[PDB]
Design a protein around this motif. Sequence first.
Motif, PDB file in Angstrom:
ATOM      1  N   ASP A 111      -1.890  -0.389  -2.664  1.00 10.82           N
ATOM      2  CA  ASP A 111      -1.479   0.103  -3.975  1.00 10.82           C
ATOM      3  C   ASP A 111      -2.675   0.491  -4.840  1.00 10.82           C
ATOM      4  O   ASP A 111      -2.506   0.799  -6.016  1.00 10.82           O
ATOM      5  CB  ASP A 111      -0.574  -0.902  -4.707  1.00 10.82           C
ATOM      6  CG  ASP A 111       0.641  -0.237  -5.356  1.00 10.82           C
ATOM      7  OD1 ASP A 111       1.681  -0.902  -5.487  1.00 10.82           O
ATOM      8  OD2 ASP A 111       0.564   0.953  -5.738  1.00 10.82           O
ATOM      9  N   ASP A 141       3.552   3.456  -9.227  1.00  7.31           N
ATOM     10  CA  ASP A 141       3.436   4.920  -9.256  1.00  7.31           C
ATOM     11  C   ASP A 141       4.756   5.683  -9.189  1.00  7.31           C
ATOM     12  O   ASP A 141       4.803   6.857  -9.561  1.00  7.31           O
ATOM     13  CB  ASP A 141       2.565   5.388  -8.089  1.00  7.31           C
ATOM     14  CG  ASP A 141       1.218   4.705  -8.057  1.00  7.31           C
ATOM     15  OD1 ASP A 141       0.736   4.311  -9.137  1.00  7.31           O
ATOM     16  OD2 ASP A 141       0.639   4.542  -6.955  1.00  7.31           O
ATOM     17  N   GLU A 149      -3.971   3.131  -3.778  1.00  7.23           N
ATOM     18  CA  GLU A 149      -3.678   4.547  -3.557  1.00  7.23           C
ATOM     19  C   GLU A 149      -2.669   5.009  -4.583  1.00  7.23           C
ATOM     20  O   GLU A 149      -1.864   4.213  -5.064  1.00  7.23           O
ATOM     21  CB  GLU A 149      -3.065   4.788  -2.172  1.00  7.23           C
ATOM     22  CG  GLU A 149      -3.800   4.186  -1.001  1.00  7.23           C
ATOM     23  CD  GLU A 149      -5.273   4.515  -0.972  1.00  7.23           C
ATOM     24  OE1 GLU A 149      -5.677   5.589  -1.472  1.00  7.23           O
ATOM     25  OE2 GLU A 149      -6.028   3.693  -0.421  1.00  7.23           O
ATOM     26  N   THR A 150      -2.693   6.295  -4.911  1.00  7.31           N
ATOM     27  CA  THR A 150      -1.637   6.873  -5.728  1.00  7.31           C
ATOM     28  C   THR A 150      -0.517   7.385  -4.827  1.00  7.31           C
ATOM     29  O   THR A 150      -0.718   8.303  -4.029  1.00  7.31           O
ATOM     30  CB  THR A 150      -2.158   7.989  -6.639  1.00  7.31           C
ATOM     31  OG1 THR A 150      -3.154   7.450  -7.510  1.00  7.31           O
ATOM     32  CG2 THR A 150      -1.018   8.576  -7.483  1.00  7.31           C
ATOM     33  N   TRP A 151       0.652   6.759  -4.955  1.00  6.71           N
ATOM     34  CA  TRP A 151       1.829   7.091  -4.157  1.00  6.71           C
ATOM     35  C   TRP A 151       2.749   8.025  -4.927  1.00  6.71           C
ATOM     36  O   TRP A 151       2.966   7.829  -6.121  1.00  6.71           O
ATOM     37  CB  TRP A 151       2.583   5.810  -3.795  1.00  6.71           C
ATOM     38  CG  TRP A 151       1.762   4.913  -2.951  1.00  6.71           C
ATOM     39  CD1 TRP A 151       1.192   3.728  -3.320  1.00  6.71           C
ATOM     40  CD2 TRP A 151       1.377   5.140  -1.591  1.00  6.71           C
ATOM     41  NE1 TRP A 151       0.493   3.196  -2.270  1.00  6.71           N
ATOM     42  CE2 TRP A 151       0.586   4.041  -1.195  1.00  6.71           C
ATOM     43  CE3 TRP A 151       1.627   6.164  -0.666  1.00  6.71           C
ATOM     44  CZ2 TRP A 151       0.040   3.935   0.093  1.00  6.71           C
ATOM     45  CZ3 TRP A 151       1.092   6.057   0.613  1.00  6.71           C
ATOM     46  CH2 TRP A 151       0.304   4.950   0.979  1.00  6.71           C
ATOM     47  N   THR A 164       5.549  -0.182  -5.899  1.00  7.10           N
ATOM     48  CA  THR A 164       4.387   0.436  -6.526  1.00  7.10           C
ATOM     49  C   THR A 164       4.647   0.746  -8.019  1.00  7.10           C
ATOM     50  O   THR A 164       5.782   1.031  -8.411  1.00  7.10           O
ATOM     51  CB  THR A 164       3.949   1.716  -5.759  1.00  7.10           C
ATOM     52  OG1 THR A 164       2.797   2.296  -6.386  1.00  7.10           O
ATOM     53  CG2 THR A 164       5.080   2.759  -5.696  1.00  7.10           C
TER      54      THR A 164
END
Lengths: 165, 166
Positions: free
Chosen positions: B100, B25, B102-104, B23
């Motif tokens: 991805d 993030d 999504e904010t991880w 990711t």
Amino acid sequence: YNVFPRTLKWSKMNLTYRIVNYTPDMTHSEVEKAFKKAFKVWSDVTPLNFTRLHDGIADIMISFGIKEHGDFYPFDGPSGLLAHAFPPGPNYGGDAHFDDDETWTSSSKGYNLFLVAAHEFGHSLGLDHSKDPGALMFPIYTYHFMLPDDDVQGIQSLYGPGDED
Amino acid sequence: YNVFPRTLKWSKMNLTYRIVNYTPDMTHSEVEKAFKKAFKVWSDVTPLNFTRLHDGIADIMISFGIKEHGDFYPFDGPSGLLAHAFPPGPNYGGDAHFDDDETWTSSSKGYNLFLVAAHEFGHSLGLDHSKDPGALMFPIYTYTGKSHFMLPDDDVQGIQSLYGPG
Ligand SMILES: C[C@]1(CS(=O)(=O)N2CCN(c3ncc(OCc4cccc(C#N)c4)cn3)CC2)NC(=O)NC1=O
Ligand SMILES: C[C@]1(CS(=O)(=O)N2CCN(c3ncc(OCc4cccc(C#N)c4)cn3)CC2)NC(=O)NC1=O
Ligand SMILES: [Ca+2]
Ligand SMILES: [Ca+2]
Ligand SMILES: [Ca+2]
Ligand SMILES: [Ca+2]
Ligand code: NA
Ligand code: NA
Ligand SMILES: [Zn+2]
Ligand SMILES: [Zn+2]
Ligand SMILES: [Zn+2]
Ligand SMILES: [Zn+2]
């Protein structure tokens, strides 16, 4: 807790299907009749119930398509691959696709849509291929139908018999 | 006749995983730490062991993707579907894909990667969803705010019902 089921099958007995589009070769009625009959082959010997949805998301999405039509199993023009269906599961699971470069018929001519669909719905419900040469799930097309015993034994292994009379 | 057979548990205790990609993030180190910890949840209470491979094929292939990403189970942008994993088996079996869009995060600003991964690997190991509302395998994301995570008993019992205790 819950571990995953032993076999790939639908966790529910009430299943929906949707005819997303239609073949040039037969009327809407003929196509509807053939699929209703093909589902009845399986519901008659299990507790499974099948209801048709006109729009929206159904469990078994049925469509006619050619060549690349949105999955890893492109069709190949006339003959060869006639159709395919995915095992029970989410999204494309259960869905049945028919090669519309075939000639589909309600009779002995071309490929009988009912017979091929009955075989396909076997896959949609969780049956793979049989080595019994008389079986519906014996992966060779041939043309009052009665679901052969191997197929009854197979589907009932997954879903039970439902009402036996 | 034949049915589609379902591998109910890995027949070997030593399993491999590969982090195929990462990711934006989190740092590489943060991602590796989250997945390692997520596997430890399950290996701590079973005889299962997990080894990281850098190259080639591994039992549990881990990747980040968006929208349609190679399996026709497309992701859906921010929120909704966060990730998915395949039950035990060859090829796609065991693999875990994370959306991805999504904010991880290593902490709380978004979806905690460790937490969602631990849930995913539950699926990779053969666990379906629990009806126990406190269970890790209960399908609603929550975050305790605590630095320590303790695998709820329901999940312990579930995973141990397949592989036994450690
Ligand atoms: C991969 C492929 C190829 S396919 O697309 O070529 N394929 C579909 C259709 N299939 C078939 N359909 C109906 C059958 O009924 C037999 C039967 C039994 C009893 C009485 C009567 C009578 N009267 C008939 C048998 N086999 C042949 C294989 N696609 C797929 O879904 N499976 C596959 O093998
Ligand atoms: C289909 C979907 C949808 S999904 O992508 O939306 N999904 C993934 C993640 N999942 C989840 N993850 C972590 C959880 O931990 C709970 C918990 C317990 C105890 C302490 C703490 C703490 N601190 C947390 C719970 N549920 C929610 C559902 N994908 C899939 O893999 N399953 C699915 O339902
Ligand atoms: Ca479906
Ligand atoms: Ca063809
Ligand atoms: Ca795998
Ligand atoms: Ca999403
Ligand atoms: Na046609
Ligand atoms: Na992201
Ligand atoms: Zn298809
Ligand atoms: Zn077949
Ligand atoms: Zn995926
Ligand atoms: Zn889940």
